[model samples]
Target chain A: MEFMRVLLIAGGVSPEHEVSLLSAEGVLRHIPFPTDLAVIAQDGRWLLGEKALTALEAKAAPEGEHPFPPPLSWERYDVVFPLLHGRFGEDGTVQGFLELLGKPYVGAGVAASALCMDKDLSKRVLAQAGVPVVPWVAVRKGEPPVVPFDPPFFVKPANTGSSVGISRVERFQDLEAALALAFRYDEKAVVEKALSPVRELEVGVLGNVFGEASPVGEVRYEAPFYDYETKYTPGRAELLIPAPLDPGTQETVQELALKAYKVLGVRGMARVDFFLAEGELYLNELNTIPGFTPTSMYPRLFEAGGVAYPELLRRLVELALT
Target chain B: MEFMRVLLIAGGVSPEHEVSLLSAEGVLRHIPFPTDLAVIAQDGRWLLGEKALTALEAKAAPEGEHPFPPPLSWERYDVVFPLLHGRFGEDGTVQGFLELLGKPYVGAGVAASALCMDKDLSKRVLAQAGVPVVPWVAVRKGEPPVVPFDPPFFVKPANTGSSVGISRVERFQDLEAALALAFRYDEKAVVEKALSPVRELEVGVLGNVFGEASPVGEVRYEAPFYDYETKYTPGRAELLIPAPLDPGTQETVQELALKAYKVLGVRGMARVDFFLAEGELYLNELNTIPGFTPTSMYPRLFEAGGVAYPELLRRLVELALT
Candidate 1:
């Protein structure tokens, strides 16, 4: 009898390279199956084979006498879990390659992943689906944009996976710098009015077509805003499971999470984020390929929903096959 | 100077296989440059290299003792023009693979291609972008659906690449069979009210980020509805470039075509269809990879707009590079 062969793909050319490696490491430890590994290096070339596991953990590139086979030429695995984040990984490129190979891999399919990655398009689609979303103004490089909404707006790169190229503008004078910072990461930028004193909530979804949402979790932080450093570094940001809320609010969050998951045509899993302000909820963004570290909210949210870490990993792969 | 290397990818595992081959043959004849070729066989295996040209033109699979390098392993071309249409080719899967390779290719990006491939999602997105579209109700396999539109509704498989699995439901009794036929092609289906006594219009868009729309064209067909057989078969359907319309109406069509093209983020070219009913216009669908055969409307519409066939192909490749 053969063990379920899972190929774990991680590390990418995106800015979130280190964070993605951490996710692959945790998924490697908890996944309830033997695994093959493929690590996409920072230079955009892929490193493969059993030694890729060692290379990933040691924080170094794999050294091989012979060249590794291109990803398309690789042997078939029962299921593929791409534990990658940001551009090449999360924004439908890897998913597209897997789709062309006709292999089942975890997370959202191409269209959904690409749409969710672009914040402006996702918000537009969600709004059309009757989901309440934060009002936004699109910004491009050459043309100046007008913000019809009130101050303390966030200028963000629409396609970035991490909270890296985001800026909070309280004054109109600081708009250009924010837009410049965002345009550095992506050509398309979005400006959304900041939800004042908002409770940053996230929901974990599991399944395909009709996904089941876990208990809502709150990301508690006091850094003015959630930054990349605070998100991954230890003890910087703490997660509150089943964030203190009324029964009605909890149900609304869970329902919206599942709705966004299916509405975007997401398959395996997603972290549906929300901004709760003035007793009104607004869908913030859908992270198609969310974090998978032990401390990540994706696992903890489902943990509160009664699925353990290893079981969560197993279920994700199962969702892929189905 | 090295002749700019171009890869002409054609043939795929779609219902439009033969039509795509015909398009490829036309492109092969008119393309004003040296080229490499790759043909995606019916079974989804790739037949590559110089020999693929002969196989494609001969209307047979390439016969060779040597296995070609996997798509990912092949030497990079200056630009890739994926000239295949429908599901695996036109639905963002091929575009996604190109994105993973970090190679520039013709047509819409992954998100746009996938969204446009899905009739339901595309209409929703287009509506949000201020383009008027025919109202639709989604239908699934197990659950029965209620379509409140008048008699003679069009039941279509949302993700099909061609006009296959589409039935005009004039009588409510035949709804089940239409749905069952649509369900054979895609998991998600849609029911849209058919526009009566309408002139089917199409516009050719060329460029990326922002595209220029060609003159509006009309399909003059005697059939009740444009079927796949009538569409591809010779002498069945006639294309009237610069569709005889009021100057105001023609201007409206071109503006709408350009707007839909930019809103969808299509890079290379798109065939934006419209329905002129009761003196109003409604955006129908955007075909990212429009047909390229001599008789195909895509090339003819552009040719009418002053861009010749060879120049259209040249410009499409240029758009991919940019």
Candidate 2:
């Protein structure tokens, strides 16, 4: 067998470093071998392995605090399976390196990756494409919020993932504290009008240039919101496969999800999240590199669509090599 | 004097390798460095310092064929001037690497650079922005020309720069030959409807995020088309510092150029080229990393706009740091 060795790159230089490692591990367990793998944690500058995880305090150090050796040869890998979430991984930094190397990798290209990571930019593009999205306004650091819409909104960093640094506020008085938390992760923060009692629906898309969305899956989180702890921590959140919906509405969500993916120039794979209330759908955001944890909604959505884990990995590898 | 060292990088692993070296030399001659400096060339994977260039081929030919050594530390240079052109440099590849290094570099960011390098995609976005461009259609290697427009057109490789595999055909019979030649450079070929008796105009856009177009410049080529030979070879083309245009036309062209720049979210510097026919203006393409020969139109256009060569370089350095 001419084994096309794939390079599995995981972890990144972000606060979500531990999350990425777990995501990578989940993928690694699912990935059938004959694949060449290299795991990088806390940035390539500070190499980390599974053994290093036990020393969380030493590993979670600030940037440039840890010095590591040079990285493995990127060219040798047929393609890169980058499992990094947020910041450097999801924000186009790692994708840029792969582009320079001319290596075909999974997930969105640089622009879509960068656009989707920044909530404000993605909303603009999605709106321009005529997709319905939550009403929001971006607020720079130290700037007062422009309350264009009414209260009960969410404050989030422009370029963060997994609902980290997000706050739900019902009144204007709590806006400052929310904005401050959002600013901790990014200089550009966004204030989005929250959708109350809305059903959270997500759809995973696969293919390049031409792609279609899988069956929609729903998330019924027990927590206040799908925050950092709730996302990976089992028993914190409950996911429903093939989210129960009227056939017409289900089709509409799928169509909108696919349209948003294409508009953003997202390819290979992406998970588009949306909020539904009273039969109206509003796009939440898109994840270019969605969490690949075993229990994540992305794989489950694909599984509901009849794409098994091994088959999904096989297709991704085929696309990369082709 | 606190000398701010700017490291000039050139000669990447692309078909345009030789051309990049010449472009780097041309840029070095014109850029007035403020302090102690060095220019380096990466022949494939190996980076050689300024002095190494003289005896480069003989001394380090074998090692240069391999991958470059581990990337140098960012603390060494104030900014990196990526002078390599075509594939790896012009595409988002090199820009991504620079971003990962967390060091500021000259020219466009990853997204803009990647978009401009892909001709078909760039045109699609440009068309959406209301920029009139020559009618073009893309064709794969084995497929026959779909012939979207007339016969009198130009067939050019979609990805390669410097007009390396561009063919100007006057008759339908010549289409096959032109397509074959273009396919040699890139698998995808863009067949563009030729603009007749077109006035070749170029404008240099400078700044990061918020940018402005310089006074337009015109290219008066002695040859029929500004192909690879006409672009670099001296005496083949004469560049007009400030294109002799009526005030109204000049203002319109500059505005359109800036609009295209912003449409692509082009950060840092770029050179926008256009074709003028009758009284109408049509955008041809935008080069994120335009040739920086001392005599190149990009710098000269900026010079005509009152920014000296050293100051222009300084502005690019400042953009890199940002």
Candidate 3:
């Protein structure tokens, strides 16, 4: 079997830069294949490692102090596995650059990446495709929109990933402050109606064509909302693999996840998140470059579905090549 | 006034390569600033001209035989005015490349360029935004969509800018061949219901914020549809500035053009095309980098609105800077 020359890119200028490096470390530890590692500094410089290094070595290296070389030639690699998340890495910029280079890269295409990164636009597209999403109103900076729903809503930056700049507005008085915070991250802000008794569920999906969904997973959090700290800190949120739901509900969640994935034209892989309210599923969002740590929900869900971490990475590379 | 050092790029690998060169010649003739010229060959090599040349000199130069230099440094110029059109140029590829290079360029951003390049996705977005669009069905390659409208539909490659792989299907029998041709250029195709007694109108829009629309213009053609030749060749179509419509209708057209432009998040400038049928206007498409010949509708419409060709170029540069 011919070894695939994979260029794994990680770290980005987004707020999720540290998290991306951690994810890259996990991927490097269990790649099960020879791979080259490249880390992008928060300032946008590409730091290519001297050679294929272990996860610890890659993570511990002083990125800026490393002897950086010229930019990597796309022709040298079979595929690029961009483990970086958010903004410049996940918001279609890197994908567009890779498309121009004519090198196949893992995960979504430029259009899909841009659309999914924009929560407001993706929700609109998903809603038009008949996928149920949380009712929300999009507001551009300096243009205050008429709130569609009553108080007690979630205000978030429309383009940021993770829970950064997310505020739960319990009253109309707090809306302005929330919008101000959201605007700092993005030009547009989305205010969505908060669901009562909502359960956060997620499913891992794979393939460029005829998407396949893994077993569903659930996040039980102690915070009022899943804040940034709760998301990254260990034991802050409990994860239930094969989310302890009835078989029928599990089937419905997986089906809806696949539907949202397909409607968004997601290629490679995505973690489709959902909110369950009144025994109904509403697609929360889709992450093209989901968390990839061994214990991350995306990998754990697939692991429970019989595909191990090593096989999952191989499948992603195969999808990019095809 | 300080003259802007503009880098003008033209002659891409797309079907509109020749037309782009012609547009470049017109821009070079009336730029009203110090400008450099770079022509991209059919194989995607950048051939940078040594000095500014006249329209005739720019047109007659041996592009392939010219002494090409290394890629131009973005720091050396105030802005890039990409005159190239169609796939590689007008599409998001060049825009994405420029974004990575960190130079401000005239026209839309990466997401907007990619979205407008995809007819099916753009139409879906437009329709969802409450902007009136022609009823159409999108067909992905190998997955034939069920036609929702009657015969006399127009089939087109959803990602291509020009009428290169477009066919008017008067009957269902011709749909297959049309789809085949469209698939050769793009993986997805859009089949739109043909509007009878349809009038083609266009408006030139400017500014990154508070978009301003030029006087609406009309295209009168003798061909069954505006094919490639009829679109570019002189004497095949007549350009009617100010459109000769009622004051109310003209106002409505301008308003709708601005609405479409804003909804699509367009920046710099765009030429918004519309189809008038049954006393209503339907948005045809939005061209981020519209044709810019001295006689092109984009420039002529603005010319009729009191802004001459020279001022229009200056405004575009100002928009990019902002």
Give the range where candidate 2 chain B is weakest over 10 consecutive residues by summed lDDT: B55-64
Cα deviation at B146, candidate 2, in Å, is 8.8
What digit string (tens of lDDT, one per residue) describes model 2 on residues A28-89? 66676555444455545654344334323342423332343235666677788877787778
Candidate 2, pairs of clashing residues: A100-B93, B45-B67, B45-B68
Would candidate 2 be rated incorrect, acceptable, medium or high by CAPRI criteria? acceptable
TM-score of chain A of 1: 0.90
Ranking by TM-score: 1, 3, 2
Candidate 2 per-residue lDDT over residues B7-42, each given as its tens digit: 777666666556556666555665555422222334
Off by over 4 Å in 3: A29-33, A51-70, A222-235, B1-4, B49-70, B222-235
Ranking by lDDT: 1, 3, 2
Model 1, docking class: medium
Better of 1 and 2 by DockQ: 1
The per-candidate TM-score of the B chain, in the order shown, comes to 0.90, 0.85, 0.90
Candidate 1 residue spans exceeding 4 A from truth? A59-74, A222-235, B59-76, B222-235
Give DockQ per model, in order.
0.55, 0.33, 0.41
lDDT values for all models: 0.82, 0.74, 0.80
